[PDB]
PDB file of N, CA and C in Angstrom:
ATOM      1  N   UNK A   1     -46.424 -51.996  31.994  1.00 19.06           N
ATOM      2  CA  UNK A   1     -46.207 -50.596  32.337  1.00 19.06           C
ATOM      3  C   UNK A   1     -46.831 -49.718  31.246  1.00 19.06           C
ATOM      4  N   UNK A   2     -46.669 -48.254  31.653  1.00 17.73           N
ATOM      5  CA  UNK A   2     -47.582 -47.769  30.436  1.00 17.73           C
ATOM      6  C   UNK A   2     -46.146 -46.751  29.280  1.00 17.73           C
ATOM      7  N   UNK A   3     -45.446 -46.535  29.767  1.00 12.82           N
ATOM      8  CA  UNK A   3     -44.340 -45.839  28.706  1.00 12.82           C
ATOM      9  C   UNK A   3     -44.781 -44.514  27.862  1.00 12.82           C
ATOM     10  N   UNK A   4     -44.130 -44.804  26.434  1.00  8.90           N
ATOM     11  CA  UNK A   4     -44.210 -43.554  25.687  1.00  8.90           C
ATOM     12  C   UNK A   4     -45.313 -43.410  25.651  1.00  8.90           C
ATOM     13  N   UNK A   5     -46.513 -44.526  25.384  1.00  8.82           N
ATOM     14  CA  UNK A   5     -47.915 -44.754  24.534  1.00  8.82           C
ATOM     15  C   UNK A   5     -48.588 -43.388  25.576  1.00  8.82           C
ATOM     16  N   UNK A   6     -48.312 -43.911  26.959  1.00  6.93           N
ATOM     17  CA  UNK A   6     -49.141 -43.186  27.887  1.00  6.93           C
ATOM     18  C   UNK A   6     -48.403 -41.913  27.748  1.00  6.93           C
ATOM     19  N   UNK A   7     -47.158 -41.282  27.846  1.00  7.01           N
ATOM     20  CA  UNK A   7     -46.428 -40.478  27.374  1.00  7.01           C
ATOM     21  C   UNK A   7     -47.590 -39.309  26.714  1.00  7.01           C
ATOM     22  N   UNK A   8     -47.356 -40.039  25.656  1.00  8.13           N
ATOM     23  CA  UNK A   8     -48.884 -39.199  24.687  1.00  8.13           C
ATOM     24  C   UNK A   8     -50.084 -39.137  25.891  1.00  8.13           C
ATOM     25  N   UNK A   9     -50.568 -40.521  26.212  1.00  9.70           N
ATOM     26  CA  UNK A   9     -51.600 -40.181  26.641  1.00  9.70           C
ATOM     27  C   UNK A   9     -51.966 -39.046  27.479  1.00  9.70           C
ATOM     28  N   UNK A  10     -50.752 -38.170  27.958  1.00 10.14           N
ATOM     29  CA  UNK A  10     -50.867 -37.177  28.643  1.00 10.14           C
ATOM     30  C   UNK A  10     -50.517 -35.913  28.217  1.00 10.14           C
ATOM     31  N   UNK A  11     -49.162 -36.055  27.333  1.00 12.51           N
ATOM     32  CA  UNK A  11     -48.936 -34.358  27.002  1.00 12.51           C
ATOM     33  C   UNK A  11     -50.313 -33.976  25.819  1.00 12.51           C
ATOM     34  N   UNK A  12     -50.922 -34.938  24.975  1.00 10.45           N
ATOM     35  CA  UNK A  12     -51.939 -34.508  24.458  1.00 10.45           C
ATOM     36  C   UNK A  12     -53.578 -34.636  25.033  1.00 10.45           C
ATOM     37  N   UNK A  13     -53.120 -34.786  26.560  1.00  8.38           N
ATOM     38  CA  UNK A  13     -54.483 -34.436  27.543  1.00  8.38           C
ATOM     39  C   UNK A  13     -55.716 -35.650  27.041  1.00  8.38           C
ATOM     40  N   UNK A  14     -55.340 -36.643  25.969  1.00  7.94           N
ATOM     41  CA  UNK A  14     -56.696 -37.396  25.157  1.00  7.94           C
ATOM     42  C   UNK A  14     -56.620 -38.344  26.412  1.00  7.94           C
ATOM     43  N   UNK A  15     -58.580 -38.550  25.716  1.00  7.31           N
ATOM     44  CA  UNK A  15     -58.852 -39.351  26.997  1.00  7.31           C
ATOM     45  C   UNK A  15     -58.421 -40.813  27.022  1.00  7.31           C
ATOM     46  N   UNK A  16     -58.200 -41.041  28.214  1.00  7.44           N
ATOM     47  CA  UNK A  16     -57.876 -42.089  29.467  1.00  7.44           C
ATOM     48  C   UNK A  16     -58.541 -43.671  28.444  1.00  7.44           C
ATOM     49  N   UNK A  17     -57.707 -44.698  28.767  1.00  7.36           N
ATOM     50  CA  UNK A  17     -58.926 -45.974  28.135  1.00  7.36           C
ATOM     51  C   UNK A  17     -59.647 -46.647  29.092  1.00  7.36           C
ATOM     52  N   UNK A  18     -58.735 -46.534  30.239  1.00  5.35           N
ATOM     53  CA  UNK A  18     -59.359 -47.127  31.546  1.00  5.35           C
ATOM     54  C   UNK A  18     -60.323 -45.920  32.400  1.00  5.35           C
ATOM     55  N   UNK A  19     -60.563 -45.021  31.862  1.00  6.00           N
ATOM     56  CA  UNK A  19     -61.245 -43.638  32.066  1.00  6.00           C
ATOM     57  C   UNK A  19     -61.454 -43.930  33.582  1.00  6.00           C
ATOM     58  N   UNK A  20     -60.947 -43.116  34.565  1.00  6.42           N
ATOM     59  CA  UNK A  20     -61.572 -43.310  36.033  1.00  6.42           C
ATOM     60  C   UNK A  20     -62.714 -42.329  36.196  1.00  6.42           C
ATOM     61  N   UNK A  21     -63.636 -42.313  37.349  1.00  7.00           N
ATOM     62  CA  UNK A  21     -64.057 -41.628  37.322  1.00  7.00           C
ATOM     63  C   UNK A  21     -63.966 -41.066  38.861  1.00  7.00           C
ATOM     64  N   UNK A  22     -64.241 -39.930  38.535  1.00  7.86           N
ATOM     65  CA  UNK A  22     -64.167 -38.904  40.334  1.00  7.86           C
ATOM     66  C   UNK A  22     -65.603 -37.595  41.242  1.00  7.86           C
ATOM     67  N   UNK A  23     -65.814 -37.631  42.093  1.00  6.02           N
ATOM     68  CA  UNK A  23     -66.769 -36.839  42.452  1.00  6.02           C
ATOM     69  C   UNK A  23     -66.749 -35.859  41.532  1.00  6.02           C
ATOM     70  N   UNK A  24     -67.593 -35.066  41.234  1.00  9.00           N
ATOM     71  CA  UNK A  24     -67.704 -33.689  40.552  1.00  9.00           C
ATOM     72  C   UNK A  24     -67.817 -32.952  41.529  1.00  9.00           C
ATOM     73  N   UNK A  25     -68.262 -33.049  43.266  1.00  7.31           N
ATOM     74  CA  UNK A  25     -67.634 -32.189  43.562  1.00  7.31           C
ATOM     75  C   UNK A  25     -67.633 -32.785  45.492  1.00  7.31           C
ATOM     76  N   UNK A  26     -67.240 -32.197  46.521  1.00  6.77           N
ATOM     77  CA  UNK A  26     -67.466 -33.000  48.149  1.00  6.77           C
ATOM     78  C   UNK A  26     -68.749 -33.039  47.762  1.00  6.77           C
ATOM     79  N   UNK A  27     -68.741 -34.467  48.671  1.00  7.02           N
ATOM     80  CA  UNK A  27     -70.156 -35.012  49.076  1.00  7.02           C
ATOM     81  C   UNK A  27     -70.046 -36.867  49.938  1.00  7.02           C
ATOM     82  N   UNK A  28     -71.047 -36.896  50.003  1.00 10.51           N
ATOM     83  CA  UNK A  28     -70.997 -38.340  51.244  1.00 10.51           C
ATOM     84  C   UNK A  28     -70.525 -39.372  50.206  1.00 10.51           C
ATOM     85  N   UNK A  29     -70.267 -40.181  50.948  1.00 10.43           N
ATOM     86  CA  UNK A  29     -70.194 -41.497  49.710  1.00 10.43           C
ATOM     87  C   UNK A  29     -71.494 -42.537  50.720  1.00 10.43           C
ATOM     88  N   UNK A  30     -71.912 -43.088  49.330  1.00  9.77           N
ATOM     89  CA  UNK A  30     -73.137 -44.497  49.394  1.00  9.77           C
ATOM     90  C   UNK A  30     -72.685 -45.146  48.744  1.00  9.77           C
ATOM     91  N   UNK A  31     -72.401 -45.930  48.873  1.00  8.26           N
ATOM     92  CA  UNK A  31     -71.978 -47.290  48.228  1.00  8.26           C
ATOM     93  C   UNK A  31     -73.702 -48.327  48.487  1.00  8.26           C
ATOM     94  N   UNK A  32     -74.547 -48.046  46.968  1.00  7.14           N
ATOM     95  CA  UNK A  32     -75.406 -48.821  47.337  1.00  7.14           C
ATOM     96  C   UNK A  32     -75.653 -49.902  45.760  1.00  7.14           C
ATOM     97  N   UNK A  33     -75.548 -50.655  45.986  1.00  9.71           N
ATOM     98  CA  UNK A  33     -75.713 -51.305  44.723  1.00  9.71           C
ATOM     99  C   UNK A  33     -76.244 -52.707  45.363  1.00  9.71           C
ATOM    100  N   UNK A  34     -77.782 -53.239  44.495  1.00  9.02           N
ATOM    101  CA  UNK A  34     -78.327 -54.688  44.467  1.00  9.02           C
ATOM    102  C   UNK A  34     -77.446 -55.048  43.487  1.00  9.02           C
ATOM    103  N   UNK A  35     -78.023 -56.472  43.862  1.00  8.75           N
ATOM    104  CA  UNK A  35     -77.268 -57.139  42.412  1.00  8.75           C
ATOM    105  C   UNK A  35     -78.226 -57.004  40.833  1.00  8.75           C
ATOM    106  N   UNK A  36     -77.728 -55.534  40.451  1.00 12.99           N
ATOM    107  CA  UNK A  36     -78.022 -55.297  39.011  1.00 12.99           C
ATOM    108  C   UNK A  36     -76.622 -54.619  38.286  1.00 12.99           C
ATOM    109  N   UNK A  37     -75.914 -53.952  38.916  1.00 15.38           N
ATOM    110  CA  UNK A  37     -75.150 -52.625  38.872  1.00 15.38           C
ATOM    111  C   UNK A  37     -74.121 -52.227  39.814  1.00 15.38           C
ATOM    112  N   UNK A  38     -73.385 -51.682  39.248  1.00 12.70           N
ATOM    113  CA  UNK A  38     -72.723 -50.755  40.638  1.00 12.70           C
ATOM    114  C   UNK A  38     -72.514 -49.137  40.696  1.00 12.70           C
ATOM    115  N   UNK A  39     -73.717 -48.966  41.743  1.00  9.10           N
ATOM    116  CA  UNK A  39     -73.878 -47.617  41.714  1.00  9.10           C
ATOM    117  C   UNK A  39     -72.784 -46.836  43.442  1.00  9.10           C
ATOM    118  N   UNK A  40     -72.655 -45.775  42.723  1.00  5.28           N
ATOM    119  CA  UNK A  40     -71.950 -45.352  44.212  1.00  5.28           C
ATOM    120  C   UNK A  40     -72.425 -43.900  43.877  1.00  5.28           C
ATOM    121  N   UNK A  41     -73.344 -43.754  44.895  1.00  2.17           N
ATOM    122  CA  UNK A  41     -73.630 -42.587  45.217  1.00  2.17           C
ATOM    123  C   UNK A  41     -72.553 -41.404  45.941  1.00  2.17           C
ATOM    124  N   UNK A  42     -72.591 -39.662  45.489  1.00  4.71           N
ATOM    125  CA  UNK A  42     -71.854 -39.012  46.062  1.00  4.71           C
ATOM    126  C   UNK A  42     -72.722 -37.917  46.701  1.00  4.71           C
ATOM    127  N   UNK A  43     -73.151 -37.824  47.729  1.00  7.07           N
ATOM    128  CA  UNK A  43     -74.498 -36.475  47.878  1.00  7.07           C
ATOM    129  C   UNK A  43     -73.858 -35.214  48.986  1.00  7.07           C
ATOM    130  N   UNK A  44     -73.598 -34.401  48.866  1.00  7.73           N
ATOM    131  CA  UNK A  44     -73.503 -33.468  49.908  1.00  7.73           C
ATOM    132  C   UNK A  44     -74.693 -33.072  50.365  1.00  7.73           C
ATOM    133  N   UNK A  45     -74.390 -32.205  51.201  1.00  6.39           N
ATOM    134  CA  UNK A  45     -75.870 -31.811  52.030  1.00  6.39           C
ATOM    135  C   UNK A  45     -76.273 -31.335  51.226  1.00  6.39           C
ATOM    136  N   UNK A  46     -76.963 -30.358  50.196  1.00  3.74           N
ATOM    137  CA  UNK A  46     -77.780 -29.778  49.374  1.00  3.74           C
ATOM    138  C   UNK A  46     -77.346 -30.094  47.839  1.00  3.74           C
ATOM    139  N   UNK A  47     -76.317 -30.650  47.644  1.00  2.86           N
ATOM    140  CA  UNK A  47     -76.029 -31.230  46.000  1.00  2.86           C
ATOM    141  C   UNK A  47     -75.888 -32.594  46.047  1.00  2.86           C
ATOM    142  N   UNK A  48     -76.711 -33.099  45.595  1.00  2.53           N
ATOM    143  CA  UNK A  48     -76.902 -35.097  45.099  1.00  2.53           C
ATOM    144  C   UNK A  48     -76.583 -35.409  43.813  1.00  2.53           C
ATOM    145  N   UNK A  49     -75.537 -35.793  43.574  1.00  2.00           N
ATOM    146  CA  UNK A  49     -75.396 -36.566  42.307  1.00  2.00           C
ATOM    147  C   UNK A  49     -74.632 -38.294  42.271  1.00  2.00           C
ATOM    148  N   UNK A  50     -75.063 -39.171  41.948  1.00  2.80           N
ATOM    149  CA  UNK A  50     -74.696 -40.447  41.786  1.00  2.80           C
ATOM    150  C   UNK A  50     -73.824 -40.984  41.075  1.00  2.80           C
ATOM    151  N   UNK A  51     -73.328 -42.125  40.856  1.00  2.00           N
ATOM    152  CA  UNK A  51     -72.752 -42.185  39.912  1.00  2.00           C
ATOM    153  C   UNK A  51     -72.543 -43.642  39.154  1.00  2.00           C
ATOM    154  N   UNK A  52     -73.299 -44.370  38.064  1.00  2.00           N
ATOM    155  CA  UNK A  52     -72.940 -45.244  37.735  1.00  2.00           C
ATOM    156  C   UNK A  52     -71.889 -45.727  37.195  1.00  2.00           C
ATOM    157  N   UNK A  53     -71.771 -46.897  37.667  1.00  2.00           N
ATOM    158  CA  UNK A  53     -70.389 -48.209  37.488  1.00  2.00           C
ATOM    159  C   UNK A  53     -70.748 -49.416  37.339  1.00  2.00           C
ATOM    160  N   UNK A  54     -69.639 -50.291  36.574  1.00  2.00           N
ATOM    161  CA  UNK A  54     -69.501 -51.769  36.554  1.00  2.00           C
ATOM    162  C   UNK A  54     -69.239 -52.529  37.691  1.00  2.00           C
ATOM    163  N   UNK A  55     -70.015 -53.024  38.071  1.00  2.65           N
ATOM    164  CA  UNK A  55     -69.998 -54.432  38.956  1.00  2.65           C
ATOM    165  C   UNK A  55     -68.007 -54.885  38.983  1.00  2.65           C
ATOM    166  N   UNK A  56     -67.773 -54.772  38.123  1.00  4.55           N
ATOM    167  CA  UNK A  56     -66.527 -54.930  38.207  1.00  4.55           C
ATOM    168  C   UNK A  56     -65.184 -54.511  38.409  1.00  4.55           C
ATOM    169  N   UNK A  57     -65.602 -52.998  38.022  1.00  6.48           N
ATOM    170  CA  UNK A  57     -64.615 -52.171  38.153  1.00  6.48           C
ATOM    171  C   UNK A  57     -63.903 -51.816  40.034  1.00  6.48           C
ATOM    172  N   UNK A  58     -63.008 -52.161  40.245  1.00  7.01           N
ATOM    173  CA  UNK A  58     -62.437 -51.980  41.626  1.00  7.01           C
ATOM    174  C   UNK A  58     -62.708 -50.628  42.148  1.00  7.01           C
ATOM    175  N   UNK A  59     -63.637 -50.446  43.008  1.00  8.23           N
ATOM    176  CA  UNK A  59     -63.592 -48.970  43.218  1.00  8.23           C
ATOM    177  C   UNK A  59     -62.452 -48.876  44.900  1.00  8.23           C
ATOM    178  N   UNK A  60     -62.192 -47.611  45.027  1.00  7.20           N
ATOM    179  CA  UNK A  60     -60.762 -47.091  46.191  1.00  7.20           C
ATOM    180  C   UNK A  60     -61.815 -46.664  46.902  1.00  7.20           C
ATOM    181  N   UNK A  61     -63.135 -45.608  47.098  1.00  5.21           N
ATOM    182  CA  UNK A  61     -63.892 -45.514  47.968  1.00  5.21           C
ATOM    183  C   UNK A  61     -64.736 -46.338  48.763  1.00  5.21           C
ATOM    184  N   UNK A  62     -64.410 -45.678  50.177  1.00  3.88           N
ATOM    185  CA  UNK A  62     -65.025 -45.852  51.449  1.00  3.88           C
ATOM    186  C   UNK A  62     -66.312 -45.650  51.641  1.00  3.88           C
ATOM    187  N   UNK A  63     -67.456 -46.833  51.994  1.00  3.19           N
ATOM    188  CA  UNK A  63     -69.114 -45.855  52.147  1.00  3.19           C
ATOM    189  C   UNK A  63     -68.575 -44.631  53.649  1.00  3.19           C
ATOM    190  N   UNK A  64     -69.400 -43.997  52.891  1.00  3.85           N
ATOM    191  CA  UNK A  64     -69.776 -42.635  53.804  1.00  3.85           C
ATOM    192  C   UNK A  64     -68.898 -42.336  53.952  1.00  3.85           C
ATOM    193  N   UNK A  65     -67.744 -41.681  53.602  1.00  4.44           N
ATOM    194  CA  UNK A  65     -66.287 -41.426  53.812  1.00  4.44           C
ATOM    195  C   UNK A  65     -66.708 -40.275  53.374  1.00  4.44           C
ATOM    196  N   UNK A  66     -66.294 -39.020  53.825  1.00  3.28           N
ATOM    197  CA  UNK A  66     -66.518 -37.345  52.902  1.00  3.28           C
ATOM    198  C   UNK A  66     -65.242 -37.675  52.038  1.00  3.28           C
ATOM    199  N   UNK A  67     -65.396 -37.260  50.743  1.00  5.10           N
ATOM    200  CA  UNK A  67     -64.776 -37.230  49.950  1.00  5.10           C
ATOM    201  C   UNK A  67     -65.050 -35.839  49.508  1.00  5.10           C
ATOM    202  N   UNK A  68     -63.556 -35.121  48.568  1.00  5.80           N
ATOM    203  CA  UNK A  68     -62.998 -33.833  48.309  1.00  5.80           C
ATOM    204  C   UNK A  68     -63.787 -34.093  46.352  1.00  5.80           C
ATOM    205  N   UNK A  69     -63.840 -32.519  46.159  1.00  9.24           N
ATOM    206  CA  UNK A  69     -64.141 -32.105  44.707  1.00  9.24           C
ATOM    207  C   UNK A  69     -62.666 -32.628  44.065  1.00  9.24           C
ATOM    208  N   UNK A  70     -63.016 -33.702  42.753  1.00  9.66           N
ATOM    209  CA  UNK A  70     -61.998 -34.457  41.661  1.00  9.66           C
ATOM    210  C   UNK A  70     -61.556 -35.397  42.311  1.00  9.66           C
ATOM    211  N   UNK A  71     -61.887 -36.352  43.467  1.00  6.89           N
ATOM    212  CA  UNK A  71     -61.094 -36.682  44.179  1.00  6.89           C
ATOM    213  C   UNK A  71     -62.062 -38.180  43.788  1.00  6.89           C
ATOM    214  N   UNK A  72     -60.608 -39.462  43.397  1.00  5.44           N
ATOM    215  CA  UNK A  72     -60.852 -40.769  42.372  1.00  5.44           C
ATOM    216  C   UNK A  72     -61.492 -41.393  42.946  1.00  5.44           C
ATOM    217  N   UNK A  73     -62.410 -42.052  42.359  1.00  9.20           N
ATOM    218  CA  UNK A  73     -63.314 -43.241  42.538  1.00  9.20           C
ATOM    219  C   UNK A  73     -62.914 -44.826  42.436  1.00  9.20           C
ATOM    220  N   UNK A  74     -62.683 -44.947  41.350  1.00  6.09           N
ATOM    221  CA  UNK A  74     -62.123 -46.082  40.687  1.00  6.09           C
ATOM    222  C   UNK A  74     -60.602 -45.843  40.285  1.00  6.09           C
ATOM    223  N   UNK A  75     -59.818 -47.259  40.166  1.00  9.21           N
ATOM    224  CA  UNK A  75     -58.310 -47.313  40.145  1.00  9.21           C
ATOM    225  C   UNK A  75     -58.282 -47.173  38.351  1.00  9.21           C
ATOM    226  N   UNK A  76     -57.461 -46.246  38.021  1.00  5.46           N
ATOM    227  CA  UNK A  76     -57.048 -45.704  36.791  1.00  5.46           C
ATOM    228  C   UNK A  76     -56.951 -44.677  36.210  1.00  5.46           C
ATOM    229  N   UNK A  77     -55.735 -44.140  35.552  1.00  5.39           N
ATOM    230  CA  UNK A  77     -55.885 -43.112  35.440  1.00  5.39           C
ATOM    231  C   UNK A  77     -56.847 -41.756  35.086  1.00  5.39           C
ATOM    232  N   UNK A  78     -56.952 -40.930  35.006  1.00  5.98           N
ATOM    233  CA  UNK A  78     -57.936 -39.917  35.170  1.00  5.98           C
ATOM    234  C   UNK A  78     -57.921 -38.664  34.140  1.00  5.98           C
ATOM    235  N   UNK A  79     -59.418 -38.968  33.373  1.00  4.98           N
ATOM    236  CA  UNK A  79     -59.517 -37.854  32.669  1.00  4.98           C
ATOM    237  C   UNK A  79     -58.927 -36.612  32.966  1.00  4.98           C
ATOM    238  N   UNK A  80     -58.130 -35.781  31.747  1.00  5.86           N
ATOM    239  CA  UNK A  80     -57.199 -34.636  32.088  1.00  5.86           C
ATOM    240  C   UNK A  80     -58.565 -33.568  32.163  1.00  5.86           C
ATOM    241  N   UNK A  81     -59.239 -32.868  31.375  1.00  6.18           N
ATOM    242  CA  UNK A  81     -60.316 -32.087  31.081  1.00  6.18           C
ATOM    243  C   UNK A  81     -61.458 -32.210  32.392  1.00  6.18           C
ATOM    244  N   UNK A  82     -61.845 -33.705  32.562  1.00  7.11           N
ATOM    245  CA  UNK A  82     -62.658 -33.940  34.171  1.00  7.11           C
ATOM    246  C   UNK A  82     -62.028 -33.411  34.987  1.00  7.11           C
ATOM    247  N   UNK A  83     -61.077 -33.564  35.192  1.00  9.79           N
ATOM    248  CA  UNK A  83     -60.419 -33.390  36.879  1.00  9.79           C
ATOM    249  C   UNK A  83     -59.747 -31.949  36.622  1.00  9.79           C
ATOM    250  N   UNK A  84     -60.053 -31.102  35.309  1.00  8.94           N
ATOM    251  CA  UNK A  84     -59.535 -29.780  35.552  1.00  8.94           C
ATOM    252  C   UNK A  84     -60.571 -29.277  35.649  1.00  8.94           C
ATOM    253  N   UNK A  85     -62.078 -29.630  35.657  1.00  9.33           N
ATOM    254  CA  UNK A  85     -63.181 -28.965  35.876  1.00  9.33           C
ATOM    255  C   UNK A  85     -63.390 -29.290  37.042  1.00  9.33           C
ATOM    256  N   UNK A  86     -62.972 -30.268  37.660  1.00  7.87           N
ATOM    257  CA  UNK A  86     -63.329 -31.011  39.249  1.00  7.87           C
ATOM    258  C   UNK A  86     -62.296 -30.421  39.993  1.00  7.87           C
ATOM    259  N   UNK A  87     -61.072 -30.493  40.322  1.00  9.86           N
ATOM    260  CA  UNK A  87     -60.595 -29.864  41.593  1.00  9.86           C
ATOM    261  C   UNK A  87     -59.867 -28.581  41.068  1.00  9.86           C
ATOM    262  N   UNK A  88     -59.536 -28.565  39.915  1.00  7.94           N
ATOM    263  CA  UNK A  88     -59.128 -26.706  39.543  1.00  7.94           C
ATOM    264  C   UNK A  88     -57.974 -26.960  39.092  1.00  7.94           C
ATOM    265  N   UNK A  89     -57.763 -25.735  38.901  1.00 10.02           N
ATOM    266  CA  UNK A  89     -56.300 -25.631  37.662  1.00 10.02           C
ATOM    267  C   UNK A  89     -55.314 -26.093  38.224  1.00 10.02           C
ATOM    268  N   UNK A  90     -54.901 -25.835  39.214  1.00  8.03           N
ATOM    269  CA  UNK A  90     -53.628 -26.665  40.946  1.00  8.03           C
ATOM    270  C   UNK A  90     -53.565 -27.949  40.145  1.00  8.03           C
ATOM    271  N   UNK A  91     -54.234 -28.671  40.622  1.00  7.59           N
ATOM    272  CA  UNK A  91     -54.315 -29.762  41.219  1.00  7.59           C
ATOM    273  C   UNK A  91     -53.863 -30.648  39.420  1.00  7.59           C
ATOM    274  N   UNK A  92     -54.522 -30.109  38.325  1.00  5.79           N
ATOM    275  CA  UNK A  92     -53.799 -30.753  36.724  1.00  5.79           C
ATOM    276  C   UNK A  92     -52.445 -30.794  36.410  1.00  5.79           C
ATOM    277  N   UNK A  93     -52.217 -29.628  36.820  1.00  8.25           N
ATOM    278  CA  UNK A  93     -50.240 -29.716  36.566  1.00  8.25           C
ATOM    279  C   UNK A  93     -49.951 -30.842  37.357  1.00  8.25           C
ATOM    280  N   UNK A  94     -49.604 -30.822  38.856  1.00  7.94           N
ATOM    281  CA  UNK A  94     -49.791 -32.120  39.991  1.00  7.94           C
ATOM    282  C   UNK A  94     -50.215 -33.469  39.018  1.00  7.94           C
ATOM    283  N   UNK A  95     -51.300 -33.617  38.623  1.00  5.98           N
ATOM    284  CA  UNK A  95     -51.290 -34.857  38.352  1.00  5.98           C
ATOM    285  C   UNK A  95     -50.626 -35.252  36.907  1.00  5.98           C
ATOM    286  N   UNK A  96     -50.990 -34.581  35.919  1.00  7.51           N
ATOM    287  CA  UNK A  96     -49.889 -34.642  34.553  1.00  7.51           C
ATOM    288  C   UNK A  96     -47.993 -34.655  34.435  1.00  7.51           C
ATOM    289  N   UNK A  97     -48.047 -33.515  35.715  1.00  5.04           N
ATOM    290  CA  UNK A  97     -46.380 -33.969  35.742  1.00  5.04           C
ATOM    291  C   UNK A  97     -45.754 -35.185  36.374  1.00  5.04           C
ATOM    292  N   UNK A  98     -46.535 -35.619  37.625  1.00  4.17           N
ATOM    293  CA  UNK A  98     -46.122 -36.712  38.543  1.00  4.17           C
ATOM    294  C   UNK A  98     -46.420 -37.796  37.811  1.00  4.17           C
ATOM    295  N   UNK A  99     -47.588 -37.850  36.886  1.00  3.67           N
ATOM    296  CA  UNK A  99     -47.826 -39.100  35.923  1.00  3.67           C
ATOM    297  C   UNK A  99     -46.649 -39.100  35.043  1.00  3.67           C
ATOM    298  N   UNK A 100     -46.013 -38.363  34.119  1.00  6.16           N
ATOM    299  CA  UNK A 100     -45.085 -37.887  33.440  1.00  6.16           C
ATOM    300  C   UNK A 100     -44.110 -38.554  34.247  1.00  6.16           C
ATOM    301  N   UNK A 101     -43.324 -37.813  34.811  1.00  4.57           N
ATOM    302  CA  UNK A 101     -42.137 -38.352  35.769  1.00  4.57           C
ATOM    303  C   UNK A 101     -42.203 -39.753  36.227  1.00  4.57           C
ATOM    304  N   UNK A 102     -43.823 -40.386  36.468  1.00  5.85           N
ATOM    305  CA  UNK A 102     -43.898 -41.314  36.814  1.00  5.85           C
ATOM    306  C   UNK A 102     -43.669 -42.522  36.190  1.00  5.85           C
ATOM    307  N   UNK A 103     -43.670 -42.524  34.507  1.00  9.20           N
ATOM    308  CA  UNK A 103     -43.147 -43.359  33.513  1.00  9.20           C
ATOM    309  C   UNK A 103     -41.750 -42.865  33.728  1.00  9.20           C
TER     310      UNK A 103
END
């Protein structure tokens, strides 16, 4: 479990060790990766940005699924500072308190 340690890890916002990562903002999902990498693309209609990953890391996204701005990629918790630039000021309290409560 994660306890006090994570405790900190949140009221002082420092980053994540398992760092997840999340769209920067809607866009399609591609899930395209050869065997070198694991890339998962996020493109909306006029904004394309990609996103590299480990071959290993478990990702929660669906190919081609529309996915929402801050919205997780990979299983683990989530940069506080990313995801207040990604889905907005709302949505940080929401995840810092429910993580909170959640230990």
């Amino acid at each position: 479990t994660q306890g006090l340690p994570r405790v900190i890890e949140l009221f002082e916002a420092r980053r994540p060790k398992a760092k997840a990562v999340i769209s920067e903002i809607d866009g399609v999902v591609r899930i395209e990766e050869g065997e070198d990498r694991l890339s998962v693309f996020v493109e909306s209609e006029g904004f394309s940005k990609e996103y590299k990953l480990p071959k290993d890391a478990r990702l929660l996204v669906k190919d081609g699924d529309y996915v929402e701005a801050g919205q997780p990629l990979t299983r683990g918790a989530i940069d506080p500072h990313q995801l207040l630039e990604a889905k907005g000021p709302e949505a940080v309290e929401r995840y810092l308190v429910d993580e909170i409560q959640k230990v």
